[PDB]
Design a protein around this motif. Sequence first.
Motif, short mmCIF file in Angstrom:
data_model
loop_
_atom_site.label_atom_id
_atom_site.label_comp_id
_atom_site.label_asym_id
_atom_site.label_seq_id
_atom_site.Cartn_x
_atom_site.Cartn_y
_atom_site.Cartn_z
N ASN A 1 0.75 -1.25 0.00
CA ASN A 1 0.00 0.00 0.00
C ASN A 1 0.80 1.32 0.00
O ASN A 1 0.29 2.36 0.42
CB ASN A 1 -1.08 -0.02 1.07
CG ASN A 1 -2.20 -0.97 0.73
OD1 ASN A 1 -2.60 -1.09 -0.44
ND2 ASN A 1 -2.72 -1.66 1.73
N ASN B 1 -6.84 0.99 -6.17
CA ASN B 1 -7.14 -0.19 -5.33
C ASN B 1 -6.35 -1.41 -5.82
O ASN B 1 -6.32 -1.66 -7.02
CB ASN B 1 -8.65 -0.45 -5.37
CG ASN B 1 -9.12 -1.23 -4.17
OD1 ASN B 1 -8.49 -2.22 -3.78
ND2 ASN B 1 -10.22 -0.81 -3.59
N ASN B 2 -5.66 -2.15 -4.93
CA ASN B 2 -5.04 -3.41 -5.37
C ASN B 2 -6.09 -4.40 -5.89
O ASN B 2 -5.80 -5.21 -6.76
CB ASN B 2 -4.22 -4.07 -4.25
CG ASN B 2 -2.91 -3.34 -3.99
OD1 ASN B 2 -2.37 -2.67 -4.87
ND2 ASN B 2 -2.40 -3.45 -2.76
N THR C 1 -6.94 7.68 -4.79
CA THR C 1 -6.68 6.49 -3.98
C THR C 1 -7.66 5.34 -4.28
O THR C 1 -7.28 4.17 -4.17
CB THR C 1 -6.70 6.80 -2.44
OG1 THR C 1 -7.92 7.49 -2.12
CG2 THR C 1 -5.47 7.71 -2.07
N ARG D 1 1.78 4.42 -1.98
CA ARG D 1 1.11 5.20 -3.02
C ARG D 1 1.76 6.57 -3.24
O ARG D 1 2.43 7.10 -2.35
CB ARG D 1 -0.34 5.45 -2.64
CG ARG D 1 -1.24 4.22 -2.60
CD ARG D 1 -1.23 3.48 -3.93
NE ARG D 1 -2.18 2.35 -3.93
CZ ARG D 1 -1.86 1.07 -3.72
NH1 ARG D 1 -0.60 0.70 -3.51
NH2 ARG D 1 -2.83 0.15 -3.79
#
Length: 280
Positions: A234, A256-257, A252, A236
């Motif tokens: 996570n 998203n993964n 964001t 970013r």
Amino acid sequence: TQFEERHLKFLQQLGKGNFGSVEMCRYDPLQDNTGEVVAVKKLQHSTEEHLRDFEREIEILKSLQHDNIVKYKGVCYNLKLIMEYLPYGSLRDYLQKHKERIDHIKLLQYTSQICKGMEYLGTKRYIHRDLATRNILVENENRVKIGDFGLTKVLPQDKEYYKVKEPGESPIFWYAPESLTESKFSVASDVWSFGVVLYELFTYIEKSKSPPAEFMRMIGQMIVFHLIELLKNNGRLPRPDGCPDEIYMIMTECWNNNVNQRPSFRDLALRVDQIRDNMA
Ligand SMILES: CNS(=O)(=O)c1ccc(-c2cccc3ncc(-c4cc(OC)c(OC)c(OC)c4)nc23)cc1
């Protein structure tokens, strides 16, 4: 829509990217200096493999008609793609040049247009795969267009992703994790990259704040390996200077993964349009 090579007059080189090259030319078949200026895309070096990709790219552009997609005009055949010339150049350069004169409301207008162009691609099951401000062109101060389709693919009829691994330098700092790990490209990975476009816009293309600059910083030949780890963890891109929270939250969410949890382009357009209104 068939242009004669002899009547294209070279004016200047506009750029190179993904094995293609683009020139500003005047198409002047009356040889009296009254023809229109047009953009002309050609292969940097014509393989048979690259020629076949180029032919598909031409077909893709030709099939698109939308206010926020650069207009196909024809072909010249050494196969050449002829497009309208957009006089303000790439959004990347324009934004940087006019940063002191372009406000958040104007960035959201451009953002909205990019989303609508992308939604339209989606309806044809096209995956752009190279969304970046360098590939967005400015027609006028009120109108931008997706301006290059060099990496664009058509989804198979029976799958929601397309796996591809090309030779060349990939724009890894705009790629979704699953594009990096699995070479999978989808509408969802275009959404991921759109979030990077949104980040680029809100940084006003500040050099030290570019996605490669920020990610390199965070990572410190195996750069892809460590990028993958950072994203899975996570890591970013930060909120750009001056960026409101509600805009950073759009970013964001794009990042998203979980592929299936990214917003749709239609929802991106709604949210952007709503925030635009609230600001006006
Ligand atoms: C970023 N990829 S690319 O460099 O291969 C490229 C270059 C040009 C175009 C392109 C495709 C179709 C129409 C276009 N109209 C104007 C300009 C353009 C105009 C500029 O000046 C007015 C300019 O600044 C020198 C520029 O720089 C990239 C591009 N570029 C056009 C698309 C991709």
